[PDB]
């Protein structure tokens, strides 16, 4: 068969709402694994300066203490069934994931129902996990692209709830007690901001009967009718530059505010971002690589790596490029990156956009190949897009994108805009912000 | 008759008297310099020896005697399987740029 | 020339038609404003009278 | 959209539109500024110049 | 080589295989610095002539029709239809390397001989690995059924990571303990882990923990199956080495057929065989192989 | 660590259409760009006046003198 | 022609050179010079010589034909 | 403790350009002409320094100031005739430099060649624009003819020629205009020669053989400064033979009357470096076609970077391209003789045939000559 | 493709001089007087260049040529008085540049 018939033959996600409003979705396929996870809409957003590390602390803390199965009885039960867990926490999503066999499904959803509602919070575990969180946050300074992405989120959205980290600062970790964490659990872990993603190996009527038995009546009504509210965060085009000249490699990111999740143009900004592409120095393509920024970078030995990202949040996104470069070619990488960006934005070709559309189609089906990242897509799509967009509709959104369409909405979201610039390392040969802005908008057009 | 006219043209060109074969007197463009990167080491070494000896001979404004002139039948076309590969690779690169 | 003639370069030239034509009108209007041509400045109604 | 936003969106964001705005405003600035400067000069001396004594 | 040696695991995995094998499997996965600059295209052509050939080649396809793949394989694979140059039989070497790195995290691993893949001793050895903690099943957890992690964490309080790893090749395999420790308590960590495998070898085992190891191995094999690149790697290695594809349910029946006495016999074989140890870090309290 | 870095209070410098944190900057982005480029263009029209008029003075000084213009008109041959 | 050390990568070539002060300044200036000038003019006189005699023929043609036509 | 020629920055750029510049060892006497043009421009600048100190620029006493220089000023005749015959030395060194540039494969130094033809346009403009300044009958009528042939363009021509005249004809404002222009133009020629040397020193020099000369390099000092001194001494031999023995031979004898607009010379003729320019302008019967042939004749050797169809660089190994190059310089000599001759039947048909053949050599026949070189040597 | 400002040598000179020069961010209005001296020297060269198109140097008609510059040619009064007052501005900027060099201790260059 063909591509459109094959992505039609990819099975649908039945999404259903329980008696409290919690959303349940599954993707039944042929494999015998089973990847049930709860996605909660809490994150670093919907946190103030107080209780800032509460989402990362509860992500760390939901496995260690339980009301019904106390101590390490969660670990003993999940290794009696032999399963694997995961807990990633982002700026707008926190999640709990179990990959298992499909014959352990009431044990998996019972362990999730004891994780997300009946988690106990012992103060000895609070002190021990506070020490482990402080040691991990000291270890996280080596994670330099995470440092630069956190600096970019600090300098891109200053004065907003998106300025703060997911982990929280060290002056805010040390004052987090139990009652602030259970206030965060009573506020932001509410049931219709929670989805139950399954992927293959399951049956949806079995999952809805088990969600009626276990994950029903979590919490629906607020305490004093005090609803949380999302705000449109201000994007401030700024520059932060952490200068460490003894450090070997400079990580510099440049990002413009993109439209975000609910706006329909993430496909065309992603196909511009995928025309620009990515490079690391272990890639054996050489000079003959298709992306001309990577071809120029390996032609004149500019940088070690560059990665072009479209990180999206609800109405606010960061789309840009982060490069690991040396101390002597940041001006070259910034000039050739803005030249490739606005060569794309002025002179986009049909061969370039069909290369990008093909690499986006392959990147989306390679992302949604595996059961754990397709559950990541099910949870993120159910919390953000409302419905879950199937890949036939993603193909129909991809196939309408042409070079003219890309040129004007690139002129909307790229041209003459003030970007946010972050840098950790030897940031001396970064240009100053007026040279970044003069290297944005073109001398010809 | 065409081989005799080509040998008379080889004698009238003057680099057979001076010590060079056909592929040393090429203009160093980016294709020829890519082939310069793409020769083997012994052919590169006696090619740059022949260019250095030719520069010594045109500094002295004299040539070798006739027993050690590079003959037309003694000419080897060493750069041509590298230069034709570089030219067809550049041709397929410009056809992919046109595509 | 032979490497510069193609479908992609014709599409890039079609993309660069209106801004280069507008830059040509920028150069023509600037040449008219610099030299003050009597045939052309007598058609604009704001400089219609004697200047 | 406010007052400068539409003119930014249609005649300032592209450099060719920027230079066309600069040249058209240069011609209009030439005629309007020469008329206003000669008007304020002849107001600062009406009868001293050769105009308004040219009756002879 | 610099990017793959930024990670500290791959360096002593390569030097572990260098000290654990004699001639064949002791050749490193990455090119050493003495051959960098001396790799010739004639030797590349001789190796791809003598070892890329049809009787050892297995070509697998997910989403591609079998008649189309049969046509493409017959239209481009008539060339190089021999059996190939025979690889040497790997023999066990033993001994240590112990070398200094310059970080507080000391990585030390002690292995010995296990059977080749496709043998009942190797099916016992993988379930003995999943009894003694093949990796972090829980993100940011404590791994509280792995007997190595319990018997090290009952005596040590510093941050660590004690796992057991199995690597079974076509001729001979390695089973052993990989301990990442701090430089002060690493002797207590390695000796407590080795005394835990001594307790498994005398037979201090629980049959529910053996059943949990069997379910851990069955679930981890299903994690290897469930990704399409992992499924392609699984049937590529099956059609390459064995030449036949067992069903994953038949693999689950073999893992359920492995019982407790084979785990006791394989633990006795690991504790009685000749060992090899690769270590890296500040080595002032790292124990020697004679001291174990 | 890296998470203890916060950008300080820029309320004394920033514009009043950007100063509230509940609004996006893309609504007033065209307004600030069309104010600052209006400042740039209204500078550049006077720079073009200073580069046109002074060049015209120098070109008309490189042209013929008024004494040469007075002497270049010939004597009037008149009716007789 | 960037600098004087990183220009070429040549190999196995040996250059012997004597002093200015251990050798003659005009070493066989006539007996090896006048055959060398004769060999160079033999190589290039068939290429540089017949355009100039075309120039001299056109010059004498133009002078004698203009003086014939001005009678 | 440290080297001064690589430490001190003026000495660093002097050492990099002049002392141990990597230069090819096999360059002939024809490569000396660029430094001969530099020292000839310096001797033109210093003789103009010592010439304009007694020169008064107005049409009542410009020729009287010239005769006061040649008679009443002590050693002023040597300065004025050295300046005129050094302009002749400058143009014969420029013509041999551009003949070397057309010969030895140095079209491909593209920005060097383009700023060279901008320099050549400025040198020709300052040569005519200083040839007006003695204010003779031949200089005034040559100024009138050369500026009047710029009036062939419709709608900008009479505006341009009253702009370049300052009147209805050449007068006092025209002479002071040309003296101010003749002061200012060789210094921007010298700055253009400095950045021409910079565009050369980006990629080094080249050999007569058209090869990459990076294998065999000698320092510029003392191997090329003594060839520079020998070239300077033979150039000063021919220049001082020109000033002290034959002072008005290369000049025109008709310039040495006082300037009079009421009469005309029996044939109007510009200088010997402008004779091929005047013959190319006289070849086309249309006057706009003549001034377009003038501009295209000076500019058509800048198209020689784009007219390199051969895979061999120099003309040393190109035997019938050598035939076409020597028939090009034969056409240049015939053009010089035809421009020296007055406008009579049949000099006009000889100038027409020679200008058509010169443009056919520089445009048509030499790229197909390079094509038949690489066809006869089996390149394709 | 390549960076033109760091590839072309005529553009490399202006990139090392006036575009990507490492300059301190401190420097006041007194440090602008060097570029003011260069620009006013360029307009003195251009102004005297367009002033010498009618100037005649002799002992009789130099003052007649100066008054022919002042009132007879089109707008030469502006060029002549611009040249005099720009020589005054040349020495104003030169004396304030010398006073800046004494003022801020740049004798070490
Ligand atoms: C009249 C002033 C000129 C000066 C002072 C001048 C100076 C020089 C110098 C110093 C060299 C290097 C030769 C050496 O030092 O060994 C040179 C070479 C060169 N010049 Fe000129 N030049 C002048 C005119 C021109 C013109 C008008 C052209 C364009 C046709 C030109 C094109 C070249 C080229 C292509 C080379 C490189 C090939 C060679 O070295 O002969 N030059 N010039
Ligand atoms: C900036 C340096 C120069 C100055 C100050 C200068 C100045 C003068 C002056 C004052 C005269 C008039 C005196 C006379 O009748 O000979 C003159 C004449 C002349 N100059 Fe120059 N000159 C300079 C450079 C050049 C150059 C580079 C050339 C060559 C292109 C040149 C070619 C001539 C010619 C041909 C004459 C006319 C000679 C005659 O017929 O008497 N000058 N120059
Ligand atoms: C001939 C007129 C002059 C010109 C065109 C000129 C040009 C310049 C320029 C462009 C700069 C760099 C801009 C800056 O850093 O200020 C500069 C700086 C400097 N100049 Fe000058 N300059 C002139 C006269 C002088 C004189 C007479 C002195 C000696 C007292 C001098 C000493 C310096 C010093 C010491 C600096 C660097 C420190 C500083 O700028 O405070 N300059 N000049
Ligand atoms: C190379 C370019 C220059 C040329 C060709 C030039 C030429 C002249 C001429 C022809 C005059 C006399 C006309 C007049 O003003 O009455 C003059 C006057 C003068 N120039 Fe220059 N000049 C030049 C640069 C300068 C500079 C850089 C200075 C400043 C140091 C300067 C200072 C003066 C002064 C003070 C006068 C007298 C002003 C007056 O009282 O009329 N000139 N110049």
PDB file of N, CA and C and ligand atoms in Angstrom, chain H residues 41 44-45 48-49 51-52 55 66 69 80 83-84 86-87 90-91 123 126-127 130-131 133-134 179 182-183 186-187 255-256 273, ligand 2:
ATOM      1  N   UNK H  41      55.734  56.937 -10.580  1.00  0.00           N
ATOM      2  CA  UNK H  41      54.686  57.756  -9.979  1.00  0.00           C
ATOM      3  C   UNK H  41      55.246  58.643  -8.878  1.00  0.00           C
ATOM      4  N   UNK H  44      57.096  61.379 -10.674  1.00  0.00           N
ATOM      5  CA  UNK H  44      56.117  62.309 -11.229  1.00  0.00           C
ATOM      6  C   UNK H  44      55.533  63.202 -10.142  1.00  0.00           C
ATOM      7  N   UNK H  45      55.319  62.641  -8.946  1.00  0.00           N
ATOM      8  CA  UNK H  45      54.811  63.401  -7.805  1.00  0.00           C
ATOM      9  C   UNK H  45      55.856  64.397  -7.301  1.00  0.00           C
ATOM     10  N   UNK H  48      56.296  67.098  -9.946  1.00  0.00           N
ATOM     11  CA  UNK H  48      55.158  67.989  -9.884  1.00  0.00           C
ATOM     12  C   UNK H  48      55.144  68.871  -8.652  1.00  0.00           C
ATOM     13  N   UNK H  49      55.704  68.378  -7.533  1.00  0.00           N
ATOM     14  CA  UNK H  49      55.974  69.204  -6.353  1.00  0.00           C
ATOM     15  C   UNK H  49      56.915  70.344  -6.697  1.00  0.00           C
ATOM     16  N   UNK H  51      57.566  71.457  -9.651  1.00  0.00           N
ATOM     17  CA  UNK H  51      57.044  72.153 -10.821  1.00  0.00           C
ATOM     18  C   UNK H  51      55.888  73.091 -10.508  1.00  0.00           C
ATOM     19  N   UNK H  52      55.010  72.728  -9.571  1.00  0.00           N
ATOM     20  CA  UNK H  52      53.865  73.563  -9.236  1.00  0.00           C
ATOM     21  C   UNK H  52      54.203  74.670  -8.250  1.00  0.00           C
ATOM     22  N   UNK H  55      54.322  77.540 -10.831  1.00  0.00           N
ATOM     23  CA  UNK H  55      53.293  77.494 -11.864  1.00  0.00           C
ATOM     24  C   UNK H  55      52.089  78.313 -11.419  1.00  0.00           C
ATOM     25  N   UNK H  66      55.005  78.929 -17.609  1.00  0.00           N
ATOM     26  CA  UNK H  66      55.728  77.777 -18.154  1.00  0.00           C
ATOM     27  C   UNK H  66      57.070  78.199 -18.760  1.00  0.00           C
ATOM     28  N   UNK H  69      59.355  79.113 -15.959  1.00  0.00           N
ATOM     29  CA  UNK H  69      59.937  77.888 -15.412  1.00  0.00           C
ATOM     30  C   UNK H  69      61.092  77.407 -16.287  1.00  0.00           C
ATOM     31  N   UNK H  80      60.466  70.418 -15.760  1.00  0.00           N
ATOM     32  CA  UNK H  80      59.307  70.384 -16.656  1.00  0.00           C
ATOM     33  C   UNK H  80      59.455  69.331 -17.754  1.00  0.00           C
ATOM     34  N   UNK H  83      59.211  66.000 -16.182  1.00  0.00           N
ATOM     35  CA  UNK H  83      57.831  65.660 -15.862  1.00  0.00           C
ATOM     36  C   UNK H  83      57.065  65.201 -17.096  1.00  0.00           C
ATOM     37  N   UNK H  84      57.292  65.855 -18.242  1.00  0.00           N
ATOM     38  CA  UNK H  84      56.621  65.458 -19.483  1.00  0.00           C
ATOM     39  C   UNK H  84      57.151  64.124 -20.010  1.00  0.00           C
ATOM     40  N   UNK H  86      58.693  61.992 -18.138  1.00  0.00           N
ATOM     41  CA  UNK H  86      58.364  61.006 -17.131  1.00  0.00           C
ATOM     42  C   UNK H  86      56.918  60.585 -17.166  1.00  0.00           C
ATOM     43  N   UNK H  87      56.033  61.440 -17.686  1.00  0.00           N
ATOM     44  CA  UNK H  87      54.693  60.989 -18.047  1.00  0.00           C
ATOM     45  C   UNK H  87      54.745  60.012 -19.213  1.00  0.00           C
ATOM     46  N   UNK H  90      56.112  56.896 -17.663  1.00  0.00           N
ATOM     47  CA  UNK H  90      55.004  56.323 -16.908  1.00  0.00           C
ATOM     48  C   UNK H  90      54.046  55.574 -17.815  1.00  0.00           C
ATOM     49  N   UNK H  91      53.773  56.119 -18.995  1.00  0.00           N
ATOM     50  CA  UNK H  91      52.843  55.430 -19.872  1.00  0.00           C
ATOM     51  C   UNK H  91      53.482  54.295 -20.656  1.00  0.00           C
ATOM     52  N   UNK H 123      44.621  57.392 -14.406  1.00  0.00           N
ATOM     53  CA  UNK H 123      45.925  57.807 -14.929  1.00  0.00           C
ATOM     54  C   UNK H 123      45.767  58.504 -16.283  1.00  0.00           C
ATOM     55  N   UNK H 126      44.104  61.966 -15.563  1.00  0.00           N
ATOM     56  CA  UNK H 126      45.055  62.956 -15.063  1.00  0.00           C
ATOM     57  C   UNK H 126      46.153  63.280 -16.076  1.00  0.00           C
ATOM     58  N   UNK H 127      46.413  62.401 -17.054  1.00  0.00           N
ATOM     59  CA  UNK H 127      47.401  62.703 -18.084  1.00  0.00           C
ATOM     60  C   UNK H 127      46.891  63.728 -19.082  1.00  0.00           C
ATOM     61  N   UNK H 130      46.370  67.056 -17.085  1.00  0.00           N
ATOM     62  CA  UNK H 130      47.592  67.811 -16.912  1.00  0.00           C
ATOM     63  C   UNK H 130      48.229  68.249 -18.214  1.00  0.00           C
ATOM     64  N   UNK H 131      47.885  67.591 -19.329  1.00  0.00           N
ATOM     65  CA  UNK H 131      48.372  68.033 -20.633  1.00  0.00           C
ATOM     66  C   UNK H 131      47.716  69.332 -21.093  1.00  0.00           C
ATOM     67  N   UNK H 133      47.282  71.900 -19.045  1.00  0.00           N
ATOM     68  CA  UNK H 133      47.946  72.901 -18.200  1.00  0.00           C
ATOM     69  C   UNK H 133      49.137  73.736 -18.700  1.00  0.00           C
ATOM     70  N   UNK H 134      49.951  73.338 -19.701  1.00  0.00           N
ATOM     71  CA  UNK H 134      50.877  74.328 -20.289  1.00  0.00           C
ATOM     72  C   UNK H 134      50.210  75.461 -21.063  1.00  0.00           C
ATOM     73  N   UNK H 179      43.880  72.118 -13.133  1.00  0.00           N
ATOM     74  CA  UNK H 179      45.067  72.130 -12.280  1.00  0.00           C
ATOM     75  C   UNK H 179      44.767  71.575 -10.892  1.00  0.00           C
ATOM     76  N   UNK H 182      44.457  67.893 -11.488  1.00  0.00           N
ATOM     77  CA  UNK H 182      45.770  67.316 -11.736  1.00  0.00           C
ATOM     78  C   UNK H 182      46.620  67.300 -10.474  1.00  0.00           C
ATOM     79  N   UNK H 183      46.283  68.133  -9.482  1.00  0.00           N
ATOM     80  CA  UNK H 183      46.924  67.926  -8.191  1.00  0.00           C
ATOM     81  C   UNK H 183      46.330  66.699  -7.501  1.00  0.00           C
ATOM     82  N   UNK H 186      46.760  62.094  -8.869  1.00  0.00           N
ATOM     83  CA  UNK H 186      47.793  61.060  -8.644  1.00  0.00           C
ATOM     84  C   UNK H 186      47.977  60.605  -7.202  1.00  0.00           C
ATOM     85  N   UNK H 187      47.456  61.327  -6.212  1.00  0.00           N
ATOM     86  CA  UNK H 187      47.511  60.808  -4.847  1.00  0.00           C
ATOM     87  C   UNK H 187      46.464  59.726  -4.622  1.00  0.00           C
ATOM     88  N   UNK H 255      52.597  72.450 -29.299  1.00  0.00           N
ATOM     89  CA  UNK H 255      52.141  72.959 -28.012  1.00  0.00           C
ATOM     90  C   UNK H 255      52.859  74.233 -27.582  1.00  0.00           C
ATOM     91  N   UNK H 256      53.988  74.572 -28.205  1.00  0.00           N
ATOM     92  CA  UNK H 256      54.884  75.593 -27.680  1.00  0.00           C
ATOM     93  C   UNK H 256      54.653  76.965 -28.307  1.00  0.00           C
ATOM     94  N   UNK H 273      50.260  58.423 -25.941  1.00  0.00           N
ATOM     95  CA  UNK H 273      49.528  57.395 -25.220  1.00  0.00           C
ATOM     96  C   UNK H 273      48.024  57.500 -25.422  1.00  0.00           C
TER      97      UNK H 273
HETATM   98  C1  LIG J   2      50.427  64.794  -7.983  1.00  0.00           C
HETATM   99  C2  LIG J   2      51.505  64.909  -8.758  1.00  0.00           C
HETATM  100  C3  LIG J   2      51.557  65.810  -9.929  1.00  0.00           C
HETATM  101  C4  LIG J   2      51.620  67.165  -9.947  1.00  0.00           C
HETATM  102  C5  LIG J   2      51.635  68.075  -8.763  1.00  0.00           C
HETATM  103  C6  LIG J   2      51.663  67.592 -11.294  1.00  0.00           C
HETATM  104  C7  LIG J   2      51.733  68.957 -11.604  1.00  0.00           C
HETATM  105  C8  LIG J   2      51.850  69.399 -12.901  1.00  0.00           C
HETATM  106  C9  LIG J   2      51.975  70.737 -13.312  1.00  0.00           C
HETATM  107  C10 LIG J   2      52.030  71.941 -12.414  1.00  0.00           C
HETATM  108  C11 LIG J   2      52.053  70.745 -14.665  1.00  0.00           C
HETATM  109  C12 LIG J   2      52.183  71.968 -15.537  1.00  0.00           C
HETATM  110  C13 LIG J   2      53.631  72.327 -15.858  1.00  0.00           C
HETATM  111  C14 LIG J   2      53.961  71.840 -17.242  1.00  0.00           C
HETATM  112  O1  LIG J   2      53.562  72.447 -18.205  1.00  0.00           O
HETATM  113  O2  LIG J   2      54.696  70.732 -17.407  1.00  0.00           O
HETATM  114  C15 LIG J   2      51.960  69.411 -15.107  1.00  0.00           C
HETATM  115  C16 LIG J   2      52.004  69.061 -16.439  1.00  0.00           C
HETATM  116  C17 LIG J   2      51.863  67.752 -16.873  1.00  0.00           C
HETATM  117  N1  LIG J   2      51.718  66.652 -16.128  1.00  0.00           N
HETATM  118 FE1  LIG J   2      51.670  66.599 -14.121  1.00  0.00          FE
HETATM  119  N2  LIG J   2      51.632  66.527 -12.107  1.00  0.00           N
HETATM  120  C18 LIG J   2      51.565  65.415 -11.351  1.00  0.00           C
HETATM  121  C19 LIG J   2      51.523  64.085 -11.741  1.00  0.00           C
HETATM  122  C20 LIG J   2      51.476  63.731 -13.071  1.00  0.00           C
HETATM  123  C21 LIG J   2      51.370  62.417 -13.531  1.00  0.00           C
HETATM  124  C22 LIG J   2      51.295  61.188 -12.661  1.00  0.00           C
HETATM  125  C23 LIG J   2      51.349  62.475 -14.911  1.00  0.00           C
HETATM  126  C24 LIG J   2      51.253  61.333 -15.838  1.00  0.00           C
HETATM  127  C25 LIG J   2      50.092  60.727 -16.065  1.00  0.00           C
HETATM  128  C26 LIG J   2      51.449  63.847 -15.279  1.00  0.00           C
HETATM  129  C27 LIG J   2      51.449  64.276 -16.582  1.00  0.00           C
HETATM  130  C28 LIG J   2      51.615  65.606 -16.940  1.00  0.00           C
HETATM  131  C29 LIG J   2      51.702  66.052 -18.333  1.00  0.00           C
HETATM  132  C30 LIG J   2      51.631  65.181 -19.559  1.00  0.00           C
HETATM  133  C31 LIG J   2      51.856  67.387 -18.292  1.00  0.00           C
HETATM  134  C32 LIG J   2      52.006  68.317 -19.467  1.00  0.00           C
HETATM  135  C33 LIG J   2      53.500  68.493 -19.744  1.00  0.00           C
HETATM  136  C34 LIG J   2      53.732  69.610 -20.728  1.00  0.00           C
HETATM  137  O3  LIG J   2      53.209  69.575 -21.816  1.00  0.00           O
HETATM  138  O4  LIG J   2      54.523  70.640 -20.398  1.00  0.00           O
HETATM  139  N3  LIG J   2      51.521  64.597 -14.126  1.00  0.00           N
HETATM  140  N4  LIG J   2      51.833  68.595 -14.004  1.00  0.00           N
END
